Amino acid sequence: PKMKTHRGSAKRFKKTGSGKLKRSHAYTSHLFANKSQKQKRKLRKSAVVSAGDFKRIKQMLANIK
C-alpha cells in the first residue's frame, strides 16, 4: 500500500524551495501577559525544522510536494 502522510504534520509544516520545512513557533497561543514584547515579535515569525528533528520526521512528509 501507499505510505500514508502524517496528517497532523501536514497541518503544521510546509516545504520550502530547497526542501526545508517551515514551521510556526510554540508558545504563541495564550498567556501573552507573561511574555515580553520582544519574545512575542520573535515567536510571531516562522522558523525552520532542525536537522536533528528533520531526519526523524522527514518521511512523514514524503508525499507532500
Binding site: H6, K11, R12, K14, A26, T28, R56, M60
Partner: protein
Amino acid sequence: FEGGQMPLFQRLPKRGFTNINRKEYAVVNLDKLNGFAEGTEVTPELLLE
C-alpha cells in the same frame, strides 16, 4: 514517536487553510518563448502541443 516526550508536530500550532478556488497557472518564462519562430501566435494550445 519520542518515547513519550510530546512529539514535535504536537508541540507546534496548526496554520492556515486550503482555498477551494485556488488557481494554479502553468508558468512560462520569456526564455521559453524564445524557442518559437518570429510572427507565431503563441497560444496555450500551441504550447501544450
